[PDB]
Design a binder for this molecule. Structure first.
Ligand SMILES: Nc1ncnc2c1ncn2[C@@H]1O[C@H](COP(=O)(O)OP(=O)(O)NP(=O)(O)O)[C@@H](O)[C@H]1O
Ligand SMILES: [K+]
Ligand SMILES: [K+]
Ligand SMILES: [K+]
Ligand SMILES: [Mg+2]
Ligand SMILES: [Mg+2]
Length: 299
């Protein structure tokens, strides 16, 4: 941090204690966040912010450079061929992908399957020129379970049928049981801590994304607070995905809020499942057929 203009050793101490360790967090911070540090004037606060942006080259970019920012995005396979296709490759890092679906459509399964697939290096697709091996080395997942449906047995089973060691998935997946929107939100904000603690968090799951909010703001009279709170939560999730280049997945029970990718899943005949991609920034709407068996998502 002393590389940053207007940052002495004393200021560095305060900054690291206030949670500002890397340059990006400072570069993307507001003078408010920093001034509230105490002992930090807005003069020095704005100076280090300007500095951090430069050290990270956060200015205008054109020509080929526009292609290079987009190449930092890696994708996670869903184990379903048709799904990965409709996804333009697989689940994207630096974005929030939502799987909305009717009761029992498989929302949770997809979340579990994803934590498992994260441990199979062959399932992470990326441009080895823009994303080094080290950046996706020892990947870990964070699972914020709002429903109480996280099943370690299901992780083991999905893993075994894939050849991956189940226990290895469990060792590299953090699970946080949230009982309300406050915990759900706080757990999300605390993911930054797991990273500064050395954990290469590359997958974040929120199952469910909307359960707590609906249950707490039922009275449609204070639906304003709800949208604001959830929106603040989505902002946190997106920033988290961008800065730490990881894939964020969320589920939503449906029979408005932000989400960069939106799927609606429904049950087909028996094993069959139909996921409809109905919103994304660069892809056409489309359907994907697959199934859920003892092996997880397949076909
Ligand atoms: N071990 C398994 N073997 C085969 N199928 C399984 C297994 N475990 C779960 N399933 C399938 O997964 C379905 C339920 O998946 P689930 O992910 O819980 O749907 P959901 O959308 O999350 N339901 P809900 O959260 O209540 O709205 C079951 O009813 C089973 O068909
Ligand atoms: K300095
Ligand atoms: K079923
Ligand atoms: K969108
Ligand atoms: Mg993004
Ligand atoms: Mg579920």
């Amino acid at each position: 941090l002393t590389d940053l203009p207007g940052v002495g050793p004393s200021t560095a101490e305060k900054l690291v204690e206030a949670g500002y360790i890397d340059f990006m967090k400072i570069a993307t911070a507001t003078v408010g966040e920093l001034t509230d540090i105490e002992g930090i004037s807005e003069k020095a606060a704005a100076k280090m912010i300007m500095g951090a942006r430069d050290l990270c080259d956060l200015g205008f970019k054109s020509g080929i450079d526009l292609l290079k920012q987009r190449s930092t995005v890696w994708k996670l396979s869903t184990s379903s061929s048709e799904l990965d296709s409709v996804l333009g490759g697989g689940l994207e890092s630096q974005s929030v992908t939502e799987f909305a679906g009717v009761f029992g459509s498989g929302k949770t399964q997809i979340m579990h399957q994803s934590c498992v697939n994260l441990q199979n290096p062959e399932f992470l697709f990326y441009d080895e020129e823009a994303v080094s091996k080290g950046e996706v080395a020892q990947p870990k997942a964070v699972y914020i379970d709002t429903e109480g449906t996280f099943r370690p047995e299901r992780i083991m089973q999905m893993a075994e049928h894939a050849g991956i060691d189940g226990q290895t998935v469990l060792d590299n997946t953090f699970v946080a049981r949230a009982y309300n929107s406050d915990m759900q939100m706080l757990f999300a904000e605390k993911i930054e801590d797991l990273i500064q603690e050395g954990n290469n968090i590359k997958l974040v799951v929120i199952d469910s994304l909307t359960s707590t909010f609906r249950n707490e703001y039922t009275g449609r009279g204070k639906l304003a607070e709800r949208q604001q709170k959830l929106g603040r939560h989505m902002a946190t999730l997106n920033k988290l995905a961008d800065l730490f280049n990881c894939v964020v997945l969320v589920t939503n029970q449906v029979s408005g809020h932000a989400a960069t990718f939106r799927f609606f899943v429904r049950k087909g005949k028996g094993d069959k499942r139909v996921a409809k991609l109905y919103d994304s920034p660069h892809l056409p709407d489309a359907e994907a057929i697959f199934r859920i068996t003892e092996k997880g998502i397949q076909d």
